[PDB]
């Protein structure tokens, strides 16, 4: 539609990021609770992020799922760009993990099944995310998972072999990322984390990881299934949702 700031009421800051601030906001008619991300044109143009942002919008815009954070629209003025985004009361999973250190089996498997559902939809539309990670994972009213940020240290922890190596890739990259995420949830740090780019890269290419003692036979099995070098020996998303460990522990 057509929009300007005049079309809705601004609350006060809901977090401050690299290019500007999300604020709470309400449409003047309808009275919808929504988030309003704002980005300063001059800093955007300065970092050369403008092209990337524009494509990400257009991609996100065509995805509608209770588990994928929705983008309602965008608009701009001389100095800034504005994203009408779904509000997410309970923040980022990254923040929730830095609080609790690690997550119980029940919480994790829930989070997984949400993520898997989201990605079943994406893959229905031939879209791949390639950057599923905790900083990208926002928590809903019911503590529901909303995946955000579609478009493209810890710049490589969730990446599979075939992408560090510039090789052909498919949807099985989200499955790798999912296994990485399962591990991080249960264990509190990623499985291939090393001190250096090169040592991390060494670890991923060899799928060299180990489990803390306390990790259960169930999670071990599923995580192990997901982190296989060969992408064609990773499971389908159906098989994850049907996994004994997942059924057992998901809300």
């Amino acid at each position: 539609r057509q929009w300007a700031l005049e079309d809705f009421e601004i609350g006060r800051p809901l977090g401050k990021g690299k290019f500007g601030n999300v604020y709470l906001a309400r449409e003047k008619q309808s009275k919808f609770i929504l988030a309003l991300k704002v980005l300063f044109k001059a800093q955007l143009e300065k970092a050369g992020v403008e092209h990337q942002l524009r494509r990400e919008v257009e991609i996100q815009s065509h995805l509608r799922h209770p588990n994928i954070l929705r983008l309602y629209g965008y608009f701009h003025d001389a100095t800034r760009v504005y994203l009408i985004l779904e509000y997410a009361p309970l923040g980022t999973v990254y923040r929730e993990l830095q609080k609790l250190s690690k997550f119980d089996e029940q919480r994790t498997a829930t989070y997984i099944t949400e993520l898997a559902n989201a990605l079943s939809y994406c893959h229905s539309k031939r879209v791949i995310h390639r950057d599923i990670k905790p900083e990208n994972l926002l928590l809903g009213s019911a503590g529901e998972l909303k995946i955000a940020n579609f478009g493209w240290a810890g710049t490589l922890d969730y990446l599979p072999p075939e992408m560090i190596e510039g090789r052909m890739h498919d949807e099985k990259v989200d499955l790798w990322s999912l296994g990485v995420l399962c591990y991080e949830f249960l264990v509190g740090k990623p499985p291939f984390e090393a001190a250096t780019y090169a040592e991390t890269y060494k670890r991923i290419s060899r799928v060299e990881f180990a489990f803390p003692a306390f990790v259960t036979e169930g999670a071990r099995d599923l995580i192990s299934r997901l982190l296989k070098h060969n992408p064609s020996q990773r499971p389908m998303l159906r098989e994850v949702l049907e996994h004994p460990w997942i059924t057992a522990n998901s809300s």
């Binding site: 009421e9 006060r12 601030n21 704002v38 300063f40 100095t79 800034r80």
Partner: peptide
């Protein structure tokens, strides 16, 4: 909680941007 509207809101965002420079 407290939803400002109008030029109050305008001032809000503009001030925030000014600050963004630093």
């Amino acid at each position: 909680e407290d939803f400002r509207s109008g030029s109050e809101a305008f001032d809000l965002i503009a001030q925030d941007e000014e600050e963004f420079n630093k």
